[PDB]
Amino acid sequence: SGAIYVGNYRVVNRHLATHNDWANLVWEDSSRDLLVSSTTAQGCDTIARCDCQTGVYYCSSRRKHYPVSFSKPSLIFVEASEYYPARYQSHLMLAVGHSEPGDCGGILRCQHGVVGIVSTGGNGLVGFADVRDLLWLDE
Numbered sequence: 001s002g003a004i005y006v007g008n009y010r011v012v013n014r015h016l017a018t019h020n021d022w023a024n025l026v027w028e029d030s031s032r033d034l035l036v037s038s039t040t041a042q043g044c045d046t047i048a049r050c051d052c053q054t055g056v057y058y059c060s061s062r063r064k065h066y067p068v069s070f071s072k073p074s075l076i077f078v079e080a081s082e083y084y085p086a087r088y089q090s091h092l093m094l095a096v097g098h099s100e101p102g103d104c105g106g107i108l109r110c111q112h113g114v115v116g117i118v119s120t121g122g123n124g125l126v127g128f129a130d131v132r133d134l135l136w137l138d139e
């Protein structure tokens, strides 16, 4: 679990969005596993606007932060789950690191701010949904 809070927006994994997120929907994209909902309270997370390929992510299944080197956002094949059929997920960045399904939502950050959130994983792999291209999150 986990979300990004910026301006009057809440960014979460689409597969973990609540009834309240859908009732206050701003934008969603199944191909990216992202959903954005509106908030009444102001948020203070900063979104990175950069091309960093290194950062630190929060891993809730270990209660720890780990440094990672990750690939540039791309279309990556993701096996079927209870949430989606087998498909290419877009804007996904992979790295070597520990992740379990419940780790989705953990923030990936570089020195410029929030890069994305955990969205996929594998055996010794962790995948992050990029949010740096969503320029409208800042206006």
Ligand SMILES: COc1ccc(S(C)(=O)=O)cc1NC(=O)N1CCC[C@H](C(N)=O)C1
Residues within 6 Å of the ligand: 015, 033, 078, 081, 083, 084, 089, 099, 100, 101, 102, 103, 104, 118, 119, 120, 121, 122, 123, 124
């Ligand atoms: C952090 O997630 C995992 C971590 C580890 C593994 S495993 C035990 O196969 O190594 C599997 C996963 N599960 C995972 O990638 N997804 C399930 C939830 C929806 C995700 C999506 N964006 O399509 C896909």
Ligand SMILES: [Zn+2]
Residues within 6 Å of the ligand: 048, 049, 050, 051, 052, 110, 111, 112, 113
């Ligand atoms: Zn950066």
